[model samples]
Target chain A: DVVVQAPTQVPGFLGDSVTLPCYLQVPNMEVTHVSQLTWARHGESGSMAVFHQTQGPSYSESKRLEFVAARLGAELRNASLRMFGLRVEDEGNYTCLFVTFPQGSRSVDIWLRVLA
Target chain B: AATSRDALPNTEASGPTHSKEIPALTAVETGATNPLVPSDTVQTRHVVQHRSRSESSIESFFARGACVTIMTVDNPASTTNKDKLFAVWKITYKDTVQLRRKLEFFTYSRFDMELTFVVTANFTETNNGHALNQVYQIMYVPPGAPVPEKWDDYTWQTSSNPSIFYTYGTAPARISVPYVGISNAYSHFYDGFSKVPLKDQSAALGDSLYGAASLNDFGILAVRVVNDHNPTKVTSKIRVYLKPKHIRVWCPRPPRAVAYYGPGVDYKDGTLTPLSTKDLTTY
Candidate 1:
């Protein structure tokens, strides 16, 4: 079994960078090749972004795509996302979905609060 | 003013009939005082008299028809913004009808409007035996396409949520419309059902269409609501808004892109293929 974990709340100063930590734990196991990872805006606003094992990533025509980062294929153990120049609209809930082989997808929600 | 309202091919286009998934709009519990009575202004999830401008917009849209225009050298350039393939426009129309008294009465008012350049107005028509309401829809315009004025235009998927006016005792039934946007590689959806149910209402009944701001080749969709319970004849409008993504925005026009991943699709090599029939409940 694989577990996707992260902080309940993430904070970043205006126009700065922040890394939303998402660690993959296999529990005394080797590793589970995460096939797909999706980072989406949740709650009030529901726009979404995704990363495929091969197709890289696809999202809206916004700079938020620039701050996204994650492992791919056999190395997709760290399913974290990074964003730069966080705007007011960026403050909200984000959902991270990790799809593993045989096992179903694991979903997690993290809240981003903007600070001065 | 070009009279021809044409549109580029859209993945969401389907037969111009109603989807069975949508139920007929009805308000059954009209014993006396209107159950849909509203507060001048209330906090959180309270219904308001939307007597605004869209009522008239749909009026003129249906009576005089609409003139569709392509903003026309907009780009898929290196810089994201440079990609002329991006476009966004919104509008709302009106639908009103009267209900003749009958043990079980039903009436529907539906009209089509060109999407991309219009909005909603407010007005209510009523009488001793009249109930006013409207239909809502999302028009997906294609690139380099003319004003799609054809009656049987191959528009995107259409649906409606009639629950809002279903009329449950003193609390009016609620309506919620879900808008989903799908692309070739990924997908996004919004519930559109964000209203307090009649069980939780003090008297006001309500719900936009809870539209998901995403789209592509997989084609986007908006489910509309139709009311079929009132026996009164009046003019009321259904307000709708959809942030539909343009499939192709090139002035010269190009190719069609289909959604590869998500819902009932087959995935491989970072692309998705649709099944003989797709079950999009989870898309």
Candidate 2:
């Protein structure tokens, strides 16, 4: 029925921007009225992130969040997330969640490692 | 067939128990004999051994114990040398007479520079053995990629090949411990019957865990350590946590703010509740 696809792993470098690629497949039909699409980093307490389809991009008051959010490509059928100025904390399990009205919810995980 | 460990709440808090000074592991570029292959040329492997330890207090549905030692073996030169590279860590500890072992593996790729972080427990002990848990998380970063945004985008791979052709005999090689039989044998992510079975008795529930990582590049490896005959003596009482993400200076700085949305109340029904924040401390 509905499928969400992404690379399971990616390597990143500090001081550089990394892009996580994602796309949705709906077989023979066009995806209609997509409820939501988002990117969040897994944390001890919960998930954290900078972008959401509902809200334009970010609500952080800092310039760093603004910088990272600026790079997000707004495509739901084909979702793209980019993080600028990679740091050690940036490496971890990140989840891409897609919610469609009729098809329910689907998600994927991208592991980002920041290395030398 | 089922134990309290199965129903235990996944949430746990553990840390070093003793104040002993644990040293940092320096990566040495040496031409040591490949531990995986004994007959290989001496200079064929670029082996790096990093050993670290911590005292931990563990509590679960079935057991509770204190103390554990963590050791990691990886190859920094995996990019130049491609001889089934490895990134592995072992959690060794004693809960009464039972010596528990947790071996975690990560994929090493020339294309996706791989780093494996054992964020949580990989396999839960079963019938004095162990069973794979779905919540166990290993963090990895592939070579030359951007920040990930979803649960499915993460990549996991191991130097160990999927096909039986990678091993010297019918059975796959175990890296963390150097022994055979139930005392030191471990099973791969795909096959649990060989080497050590983890004493997993159920077939229906076992299928999901066996193929959990088969669809992706991530490889799952596991081992069990128990010498006792009494199932009652077998206690799932050990908990472990490794925080390499803190010691490594190369980590990306924490995000300044987050624009988050949550669909709540019910799993299938709810409106997107949008929110914003600058501090992740509360989360």
Candidate 3:
């Protein structure tokens, strides 16, 4: 079984750098079975960013979005997002999804609010 | 060069109960420059406006069965009043072979955009055999008033879903011809699945999704409509929908355009206000 811990809402100001923290936990076996990681904004229907086990991460058509993560546990586990040069238009809800072997998939939501 | 107001006759006042001739209308003294003219019969007037004013700022014209209004925001929620602008022209065509006119608006350059027009043909199958065949096109001439060459790049793409004609390029735009159509059927029915087939119990399954996004623009450039049909008159409504590049910015102020709070950091005890007289040493 796997579980993801993420903040419900994050507050920031314009031109600031914000890190959207997300933690993943897996019980029983080594988390190394992590295969894929993806992140996307809520509003845009098809806008998405994907990270493959072998190929790494890539964004889908969106120019402003970026993905960041690290391999901490024996298997891939922690999936945190960091954004630089945050703008007012960037305020919205974001979803993070992770894919693993027999463990299946897990997701978490983060809401970003920008202040003047 | 038909203006927005005076050129359009008041068709509502001319009926059997009302006088056959148009009644003399008092000149609108407020800022209105033209005086009203009474014509023996009502006629359709082509409108031409040359400004970057948003649709909400335009003056409207309404008559018996015709009305013209400018629309700026297609949907208020996702779009701001300053974006997604277009002009709408609605008129009734009776026994007219063709109608053509030129419309102009201020232009700006920054984003490459395409012009799209939605054409709707409403017809009644009376005794007379009426049909509609419509075509439309657009052209762009950059600033400096340079004349367009004979082979200037003016092309249009046609779509069957809503029957639209569009062209790609940026500002200082011009429409080539008014759109006129002739069709044999009164209405069309489209099926989502299984086109004349049920060969086996196994049916094909599929998924479909759709979405729309908007950006602001410098208002409409120009639109011309040509109606080509006789006794089978068609009432056509034309609107200019513009696509502008979205300006990405950090922290866009609310639509009210007000900033109530000063810059500072929030703390549990209280929020830290910027530029305060009291410093850590004073406390």
Which candidate number maximizes TM-score? 1
Q: Lowest-scoring 10 consecutive residues by lDDT in candidate 3 chain B?
A: B97-106
Candidate lDDT (C-alpha), each? 0.41, 0.38, 0.41
Off by over 4 Å in 2: A44-47, A50-54, A59-62, A65-75, B1-283
If both were scored by TM-score, which would come out higher, candidate 1 or candidate 2? 1
lDDT of 1 by residue, B1-283 (tens): 3222333222232233444543234455765443331121122333333233442332332343223222211111123332222123332211111110110011222222223223222323334443344332333333333322322234322222211222112332222223322333222233344454476656456541343333323222222223333333322222232222212111221211233232222244523322122124423
Kindly list the per-residue Cα lDDT of model 3 for residues B108-196, writing each as its tens digit: 11222233344444543455555445333322322222222221112212121122333222232322222221222111111232233
> Can you tell me which runs of candidate 1 are displaced by over 4 Å?
A43-47, A67-69, B1-283
lDDT of 1 by residue, A1-116 (tens): 77888888999678887888776677766556578777776531333566778777765534555424564444565667787777786787778778787667887889889889
Error of 3 at A91 (Å): 0.6
The model with the greater DockQ, 2 or 3, is: 2
- Give lDDT tens digits, candidate 3, residues A13-33: 789877777777776675546
Q: Rank the candidates by DockQ, best first.
A: 2, 1, 3
Error of 3 at B45 (Å): 61
TM-score of chain A of each: 0.81, 0.75, 0.79
Q: Give candidate 3 regions above 4 Å deviation.
A: A28-32, A60-66, A71-74, B1-283
